[PDB]
Amino acid sequence: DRPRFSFSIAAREGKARTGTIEMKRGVIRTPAFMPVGTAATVKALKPETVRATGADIILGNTYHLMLRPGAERIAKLGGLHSFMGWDRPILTDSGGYQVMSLSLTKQSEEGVTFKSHSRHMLSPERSIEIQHLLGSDIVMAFDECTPYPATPSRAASSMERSMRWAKRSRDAFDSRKEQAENAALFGIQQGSVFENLRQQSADALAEIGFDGYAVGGLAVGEGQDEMFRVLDFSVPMLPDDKPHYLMGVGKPDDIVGAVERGIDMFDCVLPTRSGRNGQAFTWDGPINIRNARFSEDLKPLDSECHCAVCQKWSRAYIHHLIRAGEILGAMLMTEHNIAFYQQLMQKIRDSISEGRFSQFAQDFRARYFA
Amino acid sequence: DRPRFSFSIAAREGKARTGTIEMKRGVIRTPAFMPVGTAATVKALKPETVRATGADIILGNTYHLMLRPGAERIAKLGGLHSFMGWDRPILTDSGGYQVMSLSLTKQSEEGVTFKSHSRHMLSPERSIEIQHLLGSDIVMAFDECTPYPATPSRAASSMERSMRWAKRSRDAFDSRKEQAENAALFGIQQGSVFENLRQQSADALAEIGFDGYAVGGLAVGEGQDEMFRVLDFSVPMLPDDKPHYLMGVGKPDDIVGAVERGIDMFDCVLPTRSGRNGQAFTWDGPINIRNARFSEDLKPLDSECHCAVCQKWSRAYIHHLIRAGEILGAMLMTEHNIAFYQQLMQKIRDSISEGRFSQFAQDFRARYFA
Ligand SMILES: Nc1nc2cc3nc(NCCc4ccc(CCO)cc4)[nH]c3cc2c(=O)[nH]1
Ligand SMILES: Nc1nc2cc3nc(NCCc4ccc(CCO)cc4)[nH]c3cc2c(=O)[nH]1
Ligand SMILES: [Cl-]
Ligand SMILES: [Cl-]
Ligand SMILES: [Zn+2]
Ligand SMILES: [Zn+2]
């Protein structure tokens, strides 16, 4: 049987790595993209379709699920895996970001109280407990995603609180034997865009010790240049021998650049959400299928894509569906976009394994931005 | 290779029949239920899923498709089958009903002019042409669905116009060699609830000659007792050796009773539309999955149903999805309901074949209405 958690690096090129995370519910190939399944569904896809695209792991959200249908309810029903019909690993975000994004809130050292978008509470202890009730495989520490921009003083105070919360998260996780034995716990680095704070945060997290390390506090409006600048110094601060997870990222070019900077895991609502809105990813860049120019275009969404959508339906048909507001339009766009993202990750993994990732990155960018 | 059209009756019980329609694109088992795919999609289902439920044929709509994406456009793109990815037979309604249901309208002996829900025109000739452009396998005559209730005088005048239009439809269809050689044409009986008018309509249609005969002008608010009363005398008026198609029907009990009265084909938006709205069909009657009583119900939608939805997901999960407005909720409810309808048709076919349909009808009703 597979271990609770084992990350092995099979090949490297510069800062980029490729390998596998073994967990009880399955193997995760890295660098990995996690489709987002916020409300116990990857929107518009059956789990079998999510798997068919190549996904090894999906993301769920503590915040959304605690509100609807409820964490205790999901536990009573057998846990998130059984509930939604996905039997492979699930990573759950801790709520620290979504509560401040979507909720009225009252923040304190204890945690956050908030009104549902009914009053609810999150704290390191309650967040870890909810993730336990869901039966999450990768549990995220409860943190605070510092707003951007942040002054150095505010970024420091925020980061310091997150580090205290990281320790509380660690202890809550460890105190629950079943969770400690079957799931993994990732810490989340904060510190805004400031190198010294990022270093202090990395040091605090490494002292506590986690199974993996997320770079939090990015993809919050800073833009790619700044994000990459922060990754340049932040990722090397994390333990080399554990996965590095960049939360909420991102566009295909964001992913490529982040892998170049040592990131192993990603999640983003972009392929699903923008798919439903008519944006299809292609190797020649994104297209908006609603555009009149596609009304009689018999080509598939992308000329090379191996997904079932591109094997069977035309741009013209999908254009019609999206224009008409048809559910099948959302389904097809989403399946294609998630498949595209997985094919991107596969090309990244293969190119690193073959020592030609730098060339892949260059070729990818040249064509995607042509 | 299969013929253009051949209807064979394999077994009978009272007025009920079971058999097959062979067409170039496939075999249709009768009695048949046709999922509705109004805008070139059976809402929330891939065509492969529609087929997996057991459907042999689906319905499309002249009215909707002529408006969006356009009949000429679909022809340019290779026809409706290629466009939507359904390679089996498609029946298209002629527009005669939907124009008056959904459109401002100007009616005359020539046809109907209307404003899109841009000005458009339908006539027997244009309707048949549109169905040709779509590449329909079963083409419906362009008719007028008489409003209910109707006075005998108005019902007669309406029916008479429909019969003149039936002849024009016949001639338009026959004048187009490719269509005449590859598709079938069904006439539509009118006459409201009046036996003498139904007889005159049947006589007119039989004199013209069609590949099949629809009972039109029902499922327009008359209710089941009245519908059944009209079927009692109307169906025997139609040629015995051709299919009998009851347009727009209906609930499971409507279907059973109509088969008892000699109907071979059905279409209805109920399983798809009401599925999206949270209504699931079961052998113990419909349930509304949104009801709080299902929030922790681990049972499948129906206890016996063989569909993929009932094999994998709980009422509790689907309840959550529908409550949350999740697309997967629409997908799962729709697949189950269409599968239920097909299982109903299979049970009907098997019971007629075995000479126990009367008993099936009785047992079905006893349990469904318990
Ligand atoms: N616990 C925790 N979770 C996070 C989630 C995040 N998600 C982001 N970025 C998401 C931004 C994002 C928003 C919308 C769209 C789709 C538009 O069609 C894509 C990306 N940054 C994030 C930071 C954190 C963080 O520090 N801590
Ligand atoms: N050409 C032609 N087409 C028709 C379509 C019809 N469709 C009906 N009934 C449909 C009624 C109907 C409407 C909505 C729902 C779903 C609610 O969730 C179910 C049934 N009667 C009909 C009569 C005719 C007719 O004479 N001629
Ligand atoms: Cl999404
Ligand atoms: Cl529908
Ligand atoms: Zn594709
Ligand atoms: Zn079912």
Strand B16-23's sheet: what is its strand order?
A: B6-13, B16-23, B26-30
Is B188 in a helix, a strand, or coil?
strand
What is residue A294's DSSP assignment?
A: G
Q: Give me the amino acid identity at A365.
A: R
CB A301 within 8 A of CB A327: no
Contact A83 B314 (CB under 8 A): yes
Whether B114 has its CB under 8 Å from any CB of chain A: the answer is: no
> How far A172 CA lies from chain B's nearest CA (Å)?
28
As a whole number of Å, the end-to-end CA separation of chain A is 47
What is residue B271's DSSP assignment?
A: I
Q: Domain map of chain A by residue range?
A: 1-370
CA B327, CA A330: separation in Å to the nearest integer? Answer: 8
Backbone angles phi, psi at B254, to 5 degrees: -65, -45
Residues with CB under 6 A from ligand 1: A 93-94, 96-97, 140, 143, 145, 188, 216-217, 219-220, 247-248, 268-270, 273-274
Sign of CA dihedral A95, A97, A98, A103: positive
Q: Give me the amino acid identity at A361.
A: A
CB A333 within 8 A of CB A300: no
CA B114, CA B103: separation in Å to the nearest integer? Answer: 6
Q: Which two tokens stand for residue A298?
A: 């018999």
CA A295, CA B77: separation in Å to the nearest integer? Answer: 10
The single residue listed with the structure tokens 């599968």 is B339
Count of CB atoms situated within 10 Å of the CB of B235: 22
CA A322, CA A310: separation in Å to the nearest integer? Answer: 16
> How far B352 CA lies from chain A's nearest CA (Å)?
36
CA A5, CA A148: separation in Å to the nearest integer? Answer: 33
Give the orientation angle of helix B224-234 with respect to helix B252-260, to 10 degrees.
Answer: 20
CA A316, CA B69: separation in Å to the nearest integer? Answer: 9
Q: Which two tokens stand for residue A2?
A: 């597979």
**In sequence order, what are the residues at sequence separation of 6 or more whose Cβ sits closer than 8 angstroms to the Cβ of residue A101?**
none
Pick from B311, B246, B252: nearest CA to B280: B252
Strand A244-246's sheet: what is its strand order?
A: A32-34, A265-267, A244-246, A212-215, A184-189, A138-140, A90-93, A58-61
Which residues of chain A lie closer than 8 angstroms to B84, CB-CB? 317
CA A223, CA A352: separation in Å to the nearest integer? Answer: 26
Q: Give me the amino acid identity at A346.
A: Q
CB A44 within 8 A of CB A327: yes
A267 part of the active site: yes
Pairing mode of beta strands A265-267, A32-34: parallel
Neighbouring-strand partners of residue B16: B13
Resolution (A): 1.2
What is residue B272's DSSP assignment?
A: I
What is residue A239's DSSP assignment?
A: -
Contact A84 B317 (CB under 8 A): yes
Whether B36 has its CB under 8 Å from any CB of chain A: the answer is: no
CA A17, CA A258: separation in Å to the nearest integer? Answer: 11
For residue B174, the CA-to-ligand 4 centroid distance in Å is 32
Contact B77 A313 (CB under 8 A): no
CA B195, CA A65: separation in Å to the nearest integer? Answer: 59
- Of B36, B38, B41, which to mutate for an interface test with A (greatest number of A Cβ within 10 Å)? B41
| Alpha-carbon separation of residue B163 from A25, B32, B159 (angstroms) | 66, 26, 6
Is B8 in a helix, a strand, or coil?
strand
Pick from B27, B57, B15: nearest CA to B265: B57
Which of A45, A76, A331 is nearest residue B296 as measured by Cβ atoms?
Answer: A76
Ligand 1: nearest atom to the Cα of A274: 18
Neighbouring-strand partners of residue B18: B11
CB B187 within 8 A of CB B213: yes
Element spanning B26, H or E:
strand B26-30
Whether B116 has its CB under 8 Å from any CB of chain A: the answer is: no
Does the Cβ of B217 fall within 6 Å of ligand 2? yes
Q: What counts of helices (H) and strands (E) characterise chain B?
A: 16, 16
CA B4, CA A259: separation in Å to the nearest integer? Answer: 58
Cis, peptide link before residue A149, omega less than 30° from 0: yes
- The residue whose CA has the least distance to atom 26 of ligand 1 is A216
CA B169, CA B366: separation in Å to the nearest integer? Answer: 43
- Active-site residue, selected from the candidate residues A56, A93, A137, A264: A93
Pick from A189, A222, A234, A232: nearest CA to A208: A189
Q: Give me the amino acid identity at A191.
A: G
CB B19 within 8 A of CB B27: no
Count of CB atoms situated within 10 Å of the CB of A82: 16
Q: Which two tokens stand for residue A190?
A: 């904060």
A171 part of the active site: no
Nearest residue of chain B to residue A70 (CA atoms): B320
Strand ranges for B210-342 from DSSP E: 212-215, 244-246, 265-267, 279-280, 287-288
State the SS3 of B108-170: CCCCEEEECCCEEEECHHHHHHHHHHHCCCEEECCCCCCCCCCCHHHHHHHHHHHHHHHHHHH
Find out whether A203 is annotated in a ligand binding site: no
CA A44, CA A357: separation in Å to the nearest integer? Answer: 33
Which residues of chain B lie closer than 8 angstroms to A314, CB-CB? 77, 83
Pairing mode of beta strands B16-23, A244-246: unpaired
Q: Which two tokens stand for residue A111?
A: 């945690």
CA A1, CA A370: separation in Å to the nearest integer? Answer: 47
Distance of CA B301 to the CA centre of its chain: 24
> How far A250 CA lies from chain B's nearest CA (Å)?
23
CB A137 within 8 A of CB A23: yes
The single residue listed with the structure tokens 């040592």 is A262
CA A236, CA A189: separation in Å to the nearest integer? Answer: 12
CA A308, CA A324: separation in Å to the nearest integer? Answer: 22
Pick from A48, A129, A133, A43: nearest CA to A88: A48
Nearest residue of chain B to residue A80 (CA atoms): B317
Distance of CA B25 to the CA centre of its chain: 18
Tell me the residues of chain A between 302 and 361 that have a Cβ less than 8 Å away from chain B.
Answer: 312-314, 316-317, 320-321, 323-324, 326-328, 330-331
Element spanning A330, H or E:
helix A327-353
- Active-site residue, selected from the candidate residues A254, A264, A267, A302: A267
Whether A71 has its CB under 8 Å from any CB of chain B: the answer is: no
| Alpha-carbon separation of residue B150 from A220, B147, B197 (angstroms) | 64, 6, 12
| Alpha-carbon separation of residue A44 from A39, A250, A272, B316, B330 (angstroms) | 12, 20, 8, 18, 9
Count of CB atoms situated within 10 Å of the CB of B72: 12
Count of CB atoms situated within 10 Å of the CB of B6: 14
Neighbouring-strand partners of residue A92: A60, A139
Is A107 in a helix, a strand, or coil?
strand
Q: Which two tokens stand for residue A297?
A: 């275009």
Neighbouring-strand partners of residue A19: A9, A30
By CB atoms closer than 10 A (0-12, 13-18, 19+), residue B308 is middle
Neighbouring-strand partners of residue A113: A106, A121
CATH of region B1-370, choose from 3.40.470.10, 3.20.20.105, 2.30.38.10, 1.10.3720.10: 3.20.20.105
Count of CB atoms situated within 10 Å of the CB of B199: 16
Whether B79 has its CB under 8 Å from any CB of chain A: the answer is: no
Count of CB atoms situated within 10 Å of the CB of A171: 13
Sign of CA dihedral B332, B337, B339, B343: positive
Is A334 in a helix, a strand, or coil?
helix
For residue B69, the CA-to-ligand 1 centroid distance in Å is 37
Distance of CA A47 to the CA centre of its chain: 17
**In sequence order, what are the residues at sequence separation of 6 or more whose Cβ sits closer than 8 angstroms to the Cβ of residue B206?**
B213, B238, B239
> How far A36 CA lies from chain B's nearest CA (Å)?
14
- The residue whose CA has the least distance to atom 16 of ligand 2 is B270
Which residues of chain A lie closer than 8 angstroms to B328, CB-CB? 41, 43-46
Is A228 in a helix, a strand, or coil?
helix
Q: Give me the amino acid identity at B120.
A: H
Per-residue exposure over B249-279, b if at least 16 CB sit within 10 Å of its own CB, e if not: bbbbbbbbbbbbbbbbbbbbebbbebbbebb
Which residues of chain A lie closer than 8 angstroms to B316, CB-CB? 69, 77, 83
Ligand 1: nearest atom to the Cα of A141: 1
The closest ligand to the CA of B338 turns out to be 6
CA B265, CA B17: separation in Å to the nearest integer? Answer: 11
**In sequence order, what are the residues at sequence separation of 6 or more whose Cβ sits closer than 8 angstroms to the Cβ of residue B175?**
none
| Alpha-carbon separation of residue B1 from B22, B25, B26, B243, B262 (angstroms) | 10, 10, 10, 21, 29
Contact A331 B296 (CB under 8 A): no
CB A60 within 8 A of CB A80: yes
Pick from A292, A259, A261: nearest CA to A278: A292
Please, how many CA atoms are within 13 Å of residue B95, restricted to the half-sphere of its CB?
A: 29
